[PDB]
Amino acid sequence: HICVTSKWFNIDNKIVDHRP
Amino acid sequence: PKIKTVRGAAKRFKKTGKGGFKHKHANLRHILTKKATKRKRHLRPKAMVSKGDLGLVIACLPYA
Amino acid sequence: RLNTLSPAEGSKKAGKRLGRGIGSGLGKTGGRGHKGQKSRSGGGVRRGFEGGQMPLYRRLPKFGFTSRKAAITAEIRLSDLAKVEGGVVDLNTLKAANIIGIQIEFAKVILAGEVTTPVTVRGLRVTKGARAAIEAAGGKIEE
Amino acid sequence: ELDENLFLAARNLHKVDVRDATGIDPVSLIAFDKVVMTADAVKQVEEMLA
RNA sequence: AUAGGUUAAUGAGGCGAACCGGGGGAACUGAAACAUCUAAGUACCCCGAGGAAAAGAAAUCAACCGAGAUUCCCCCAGUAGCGGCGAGCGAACGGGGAGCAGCCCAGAGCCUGAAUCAGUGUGUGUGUUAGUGGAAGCGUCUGGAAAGGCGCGCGAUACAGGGUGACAGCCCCGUACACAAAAAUGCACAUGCUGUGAGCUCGAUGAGUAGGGCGGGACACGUGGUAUCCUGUCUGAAUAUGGGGGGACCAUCCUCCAAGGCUAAAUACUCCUGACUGACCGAUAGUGAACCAGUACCGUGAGGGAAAGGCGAAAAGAACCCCGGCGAGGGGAGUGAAAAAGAACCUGAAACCGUGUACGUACAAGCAGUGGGAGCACGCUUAGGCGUGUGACUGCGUACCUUUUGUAUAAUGGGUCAGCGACUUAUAUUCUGUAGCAAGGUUAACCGAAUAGGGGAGCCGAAGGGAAACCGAGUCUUAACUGGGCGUU
Numbered sequence: 156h157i158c159v160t161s162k163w164f165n166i167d168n169k170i171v172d173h174r175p
Numbered sequence: 176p177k178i179k180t181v182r183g184a185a186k187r188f189k190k191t192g193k194g195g196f197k198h199k200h201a202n203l204r205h206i207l208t209k210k211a212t213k214r215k216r217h218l219r220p221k222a223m224v225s226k227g228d229l230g231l232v233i234a235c236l237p238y239a
Numbered sequence: 240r241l242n243t244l245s246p247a248e249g250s251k252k253a254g255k256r257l258g259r260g261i262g263s264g265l266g267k268t269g270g271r272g273h274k275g276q277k278s279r280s281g282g283g284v285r286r287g288f289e290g291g292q293m294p295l296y297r298r299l300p301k302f303g304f305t306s307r308k309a310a311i312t313a314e315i316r317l318s319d320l321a322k323v324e325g326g327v328v329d330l331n332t333l334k335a336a337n338i339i340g341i342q343i344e345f346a347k348v349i350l351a352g353e354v355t356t357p358v359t360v361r362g363l364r365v366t367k368g369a370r371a372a373i374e375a376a377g378g379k380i381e382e
Numbered sequence: 383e384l385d386e387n388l389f390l391a392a393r394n395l396h397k398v399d400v401r402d403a404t405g406i407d408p409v410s411l412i413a414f415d416k417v418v419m420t421a422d423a424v425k426q427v428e429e430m431l432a
Numbered sequence: 433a434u435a436g437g438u439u440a441a442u443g444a445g446g447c448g449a450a451c452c453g454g455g456g457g458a459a460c461u462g463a464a465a466c467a468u469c470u471a472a473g474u475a476c477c478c479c480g481a482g483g484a485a486a487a488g489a490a491a492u493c494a495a496c497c498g499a500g501a502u503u504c505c506c507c508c509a510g511u512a513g514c515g516g517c518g519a520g521c522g523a524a525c526g527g528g529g530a531g532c533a534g535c536c537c538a539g540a541g542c543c544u545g546a547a548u549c550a551g552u553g554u555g556u557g558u559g560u561u562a563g564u565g566g567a568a569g570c571g572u573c574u575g576g577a578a579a580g581g582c583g584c585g586c587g588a589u590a591c592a593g594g595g596u597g598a599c600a601g602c603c604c605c606g607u608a609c610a611c612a613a614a615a616a617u618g619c620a621c622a623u624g625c626u627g628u629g630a631g632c633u634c635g636a637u638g639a640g641u642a643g644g645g646c647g648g649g650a651c652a653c654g655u656g657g658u659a660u661c662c663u664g665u666c667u668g669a670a671u672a673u674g675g676g677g678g679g680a681c682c683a684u685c686c687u688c689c690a691a692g693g694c695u696a697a698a699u700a701c702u703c704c705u706g707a708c709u710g711a712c713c714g715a716u717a718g719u720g721a722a723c724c725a726g727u728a729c730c731g732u733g734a735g736g737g738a739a740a741g742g743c744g745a746a747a748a749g750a751a752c753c754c755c756g757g758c759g760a761g762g763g764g765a766g767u768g769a770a771a772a773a774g775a776a777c778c779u780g781a782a783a784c785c786g787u788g789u790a791c792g793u794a795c796a797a798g799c800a801g802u803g804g805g806a807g808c809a810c811g812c813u814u815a816g817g818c819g820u821g822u823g824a825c826u827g828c829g830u831a832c833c834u835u836u837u838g839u840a841u842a843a844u845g846g847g848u849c850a851g852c853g854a855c856u857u858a859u860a861u862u863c864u865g866u867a868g869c870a871a872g873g874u875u876a877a878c879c880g881a882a883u884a885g886g887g888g889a890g891c892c893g894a895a896g897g898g899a900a901a902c903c904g905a906g907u908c909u910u911a912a913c914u915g916g917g918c919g920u921u
């Protein structure tokens with residue numbers, strides 16, 4: 156199809172720092 | 176390409192008759208005055224490289 | 240008859256392939272073992288290297304000195320000379336019989352046994368045992 | 383010594399080839415069902431192989 | 433008088449795959465870190481040129497015998513040497529081969545345009561850019577179709593190859609072979625025209641150079657005892673009774689003539705033309721591209737960059753009828769060997785999703801199978817606790833990989849299928865097997881009647897010991913071994 160464009164981000168984003 | 180002899184070793188061993196290698200003893204190049212004459216005396220004549228190091232030397236001198 | 244020829248038995252060993260399955264005997268790891276520098280593409284350590292320890296060919300002292308004159312001296316066996324072609328074994332001549340090599344400028348005759356045809360050797364050196372063998376075969380040794 | 387006519391004939395016969403004395407190679411000797419060879423060639427080969 | 437200005441005649445300019453010479457010139461990396469060193473004068477930028485480029489006619493090697501421009505190939509040899517003597521770098525002498533070629537200027541006199549070179553016109557020959565001729569097969573069987581099988585003929589200087597309804601020497605196109613150019617051209621010669629100098633006599637013989645000092649760079653050579661070459665800088669000769677080199681340096685000897693140039697071949701390369709070849713790929717392979725691909729697409733831009741081949745022998749590509757919205761899609765009909773080859777078209781696997789039938793399943797707890805095992809459905813057999821399918825009930829039973837002292841692990845990896853996806857290649861060296869020959873074995877390049885034959889330059893071995901001179905079945909150690917070390921089988 157024409158149908159062919161994927162610009163998948165970076166992870167997605169929000170949160171996490173999980174105690175250091 | 177031809178192997179290159181590990182040039183440093185070439186200048187410290189000589190293939191002997193049966194295929195041994197003979198070398199000069201260490202410990203006889205300086206700080207001598209404090210060493211027994213007996214010790215220094217025994218360090219003059221060349222000696223055969225031991226069985227354990229043969230592997231090394233040969234790999235250094237393919238064209239020995 | 241061009242499909243009835245076959246090579247001598249045990250002249251064509253197959254030769255390790257490795258990396259092809261459990262049965263093969265050399266699967267997965269391919270006889271390289273587990274991990275370390277020695278596995279891994281382009282692994283290994285250079286010749287003489289024996290861990291960071293000072294290597295044998297460096298603990299021991301140099302003792303060279305190359306004659307350079309020696310490089311142009313040949314040694315001759317008694318077994319030669321018969322093959323010199325002309326009963327005169329000369330400074331070269333041997334050279335022409337391809338038993339010395341052009342660059343040579345010196346030569347001893349060495350009791351390396353067996354001389355028969357009487358021969359006169361000229362301009363060479365010759366050991367005590369060689370002289371004796373030559374002479375005892377009707378040979379002559381003029382300088 | 384090989385001649386013109388003997389060569390041009392056989393160029394098109396498939397199972398038959400003609401070679402001079404020097405042209406003898408190992409596969410061919412085995413290749414064909416019969417090797418002919420003139421008695422003249424035999425003497426050539428006799429020497430070539432010593 | 434110059435600079436300046438107008439006109440004119442010539443030539444330049446830009447593009448282009450590599451090979452080539454020149455101006456500049458990295459870092460990753462290697463050294464198991466890192467400065468010297470390496471990567472490497474590589475990558476890259478730049479300038480320039482040719483069909484080749486460059487190099488070249490000894491101020492070269494040799495070693496007292498000799499060789500005789502340059503270039504390329506094999507040796508010499510991973511040797512001599514260089515080297516934080518680390519990592520690494522790495523010659524030459526001499527030998528075997530390819531190809532061979534030698535000339536001008538530094539000048540005036542006479543004789544003068546005489547050799548020659550290029551540019552050019554013509555001629556000729558020879559290649560090129562269209563072409564021509566080119567042998568010989570029929571019968572029958574199977575089939576939709578014969579080139580296939582079987583039979584019997586025929587051509588072959590032609591059985592290279594492609595095509596044709598399945599595999600064709602004789603159907604077609606060719607092939608071998610023999611021929612052909614009106615015109616334009618590459619290449620040779622032969623001359624015409626232009627430009628150019630030949631020849632003899634007598635001369636001349638490359639100075640801000642050689643060398644040196646300082647700083648760098650090149651030489652295999654890292655300043656080292658370092659010859660030699662190049663020069664940014666400051667200097668600066670001799671001139672044939674002269675000068676350069678022979679690896680510090682001096683003598684003797686030997687050998688060459690710098691400070692001007694030209695020069696063909698053996699050597700390099702393939703954007704492109706023609707022909708031929710492959711134990712090269714066959715559509716996720718092979719070019720990124722078998723296809724209207726540097727396209728569609730993405731990016732402001734530089735720039736990145738796909739997917740996607742096959743109906744049939746032949747379109748004979750489905751007239752006409754029926755349901756339907758003058759639809760989509762479908763069923764008939766018809767074409768065809770085949771329509772289950774219908775264009776979403778050869779083959780049509782697997783994941784995945786349904787319809788149909790047999791058997792099990794709604795009191796039962798877990799890697800889901802395995803050992804047992806009734807019933808049911810089905811075939812059997814003549815029964816005979818037999819084959820197939822299902823599998824109540826029941827014993828046992830925590831997947832795979834990896835990684836680990838150890839994993840059901842609640843530690844890694846995998847949603848599934850299909851296709852692809854990882855110990856290769858070259859050159860050295862050593863060992864084993866095997867083969868040849870044997871105190872010998874074998875050639876490299878190259879020649880080539882081209883896997884032959886030639887070529888033994890050379891390499892390995894037959895002798896070792898010693899740093900070395902040297903000695904030699906011994907030798908080294910020491911004044912010397914009763915000895916000892918390495919060797920002699």
Ligand SMILES: N[C@@H](Cc1c[nH]c2ccccc12)C(=O)O
Binds near residue numbers: 166
């Ligand atoms: N939530 C994010 C983690 C995250 C935190 N900060 C971010 C910034 C940018 C991208 C991702 C992240 C994740 O799923 O991984």
Ligand SMILES: N[C@@H](Cc1c[nH]c2ccccc12)C(=O)O
Binds near residue numbers: 171172
């Ligand atoms: N660590 C904090 C805040 C936070 C959110 N996203 C983050 C990304 C990066 C660093 C910190 C954060 C939390 O998770 O509550």
Ligand SMILES: [Mg+2]
Binds near residue numbers: 203204205
């Ligand atoms: Mg000392």
Ligand SMILES: [Mg+2]
Binds near residue numbers: 268273274
């Ligand atoms: Mg592993």
Ligand SMILES: [Mg+2]
Binds near residue numbers: 273274275
């Ligand atoms: Mg480990």
Ligand SMILES: [Mg+2]
Binds near residue numbers: 271272273274277
């Ligand atoms: Mg290991």
Ligand SMILES: [Mg+2]
Binds near residue numbers: 337338340341
């Ligand atoms: Mg020789």
Ligand SMILES: [Mg+2]
Binds near residue numbers: 463
């Ligand atoms: Mg490093």
Ligand SMILES: [Mg+2]
């Ligand atoms: Mg002379």
Ligand SMILES: [Mg+2]
């Ligand atoms: Mg024709």
Ligand SMILES: [Mg+2]
């Ligand atoms: Mg024909």
Ligand SMILES: [Mg+2]
Binds near residue numbers: 637
């Ligand atoms: Mg001169």
Ligand SMILES: [Mg+2]
């Ligand atoms: Mg030139």
Ligand SMILES: [Mg+2]
């Ligand atoms: Mg493709």
Ligand SMILES: [Mg+2]
């Ligand atoms: Mg396919």
Ligand SMILES: [Mg+2]
Binds near residue numbers: 777
């Ligand atoms: Mg189909």
